[PDB]
């Protein structure tokens, strides 16, 4: 009949007072329907509470095929209201190994690009390095090396070929009809471009210590007003730090002076004075071996 809120309210006001926690077969399956009705209704609070209840009960119980595959789709659907790709990237780690063991490479290829698409949108964290190799990678495939290069793209990104790669290969990128909610494709260009700029300013601070603001706008794919916009956002959020001179138009790294000068930074020369006697001790022994033998 086309009812959404009526089917959700009637099912929640009954099923909660229905089951006495006796038979967990039809109980777990029908609770998952309560979460699907809350997503179509648009209530994020109802889907969050239901996702924290039977999630741990399923893991403690023996593993089932049709039951565990439903959680993988539901944890992705909550990204519509949440709009956070860091949490949904960890939820796909189980389905990544599920299609690689129980299923075949037919279903393993699409889930490979979805977990990488959610990984490249993550703001920060050290888990991005451990997800480079993964498990089943190094299969010598076109879609495997394409998504794997996107993770390593954060190391060198000039944003010159960024619009070219997205328009050429766009399995999950520009047009994605699977595991992505939205009313149009406008969210693909906005969400992806804002994240790659955040990862751009991180590596540039570790490479160019002092750079002119005029030449900096070409490397970051930004204008004069857009350059200072992303710089001030990362500093306020506690990401990186840099030097921005408005009248001088010079961007520096702002090296910290808190290292106590020669008390710490100079201590890096201990390896210079230490290896002297190590090479002499090895040379005297080496010269006597070839001379006696």
């Amino acid at each position: 009949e086309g009812k959404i809120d009526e089917a959700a309210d009637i099912l929640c006001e009954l099923q909660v007072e229905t089951y006495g926690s006796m038979e967990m077969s039809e109980k777990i399956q029908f609770i998952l329907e309560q979460m699907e009705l809350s997503i179509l209704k648009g209530d994020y609070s109802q889907a969050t509470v239901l996702s924290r209840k039977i999630l741990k009960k399923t893991f403690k119980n023996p593993k089932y095929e049709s039951l565990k595959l439903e959680y993988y789709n539901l944890l992705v659907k909550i990204s519509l209201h949440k709009r956070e790709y860091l949490e949904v990237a960890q939820y796909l780690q189980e389905i990544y190994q599920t299609d690689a063991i129980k299923s075949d490479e037919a279903k393993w290829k699409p889930v490979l690009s979805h977990i990488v698409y959610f990984l490249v949108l993550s703001p920060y964290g050290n888990l991005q390095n451990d997800l480079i190799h993964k498990i089943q990678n190094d299969n010598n495939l076109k879609k495997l090396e394409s998504q794997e290069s996107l993770v390593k793209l954060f190391t060198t990104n000039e944003l010159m070929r960024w619009p070219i790669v997205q328009k050429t290969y766009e399995p999950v990128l520009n047009e994605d009809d699977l595991a992505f909610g939205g009313e149009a494709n406008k969210h693909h260009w906005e969400d992806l471009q804002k994240r790659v700029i955040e990862h751009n300013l991180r590596v540039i601070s570790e490479y160019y210590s002092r750079i002119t603001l005029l030449r900096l706008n070409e490397l970051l794919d930004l204008t004069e007003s857009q350059t200072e916009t992303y710089i001030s956002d990362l500093v306020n959020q506690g990401i990186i730090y840099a030097k921005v001179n408005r009248p001088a138009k010079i961007v520096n790294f702002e090296k910290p002076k808190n290292s106590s000068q020669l008390l710490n930074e100079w201590s890096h020369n201990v390896d210079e004075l230490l290896e002297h006697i190590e090479t002499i001790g090895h040379l005297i022994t080496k010269e006597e071996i070839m001379h006696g033998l």
């Binding site: 710089i231 001030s232 500093v235 306020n236 840099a242 030097k243 921005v244 001179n245 408005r246 009248p247």
Partner: protein, 54 residues
């Protein structure tokens, strides 16, 4: 019109202003003063008087 709330108007004026000033002070210094007034939303003379007061 109230005299008691009048003493708290400058306190609330400086509270919302200080929160916006910390956003400018957090990154590196040496920015245009005319650009500072555009972020606050007031006149240049109005910002220079309140900013130097703190």
């Amino acid at each position: 019109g109230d005299e008691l709330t009048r003493s708290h108007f400058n306190a609330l004026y400086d509270t919302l202003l200080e929160s916006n000033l910390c956003k400018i002070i957090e990154p590196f210094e040496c920015v245009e003063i005319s650009h500072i007034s555009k972020i606050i939303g007031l006149d240049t003379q109005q910002v220079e008087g309140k900013l130097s007061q703190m």
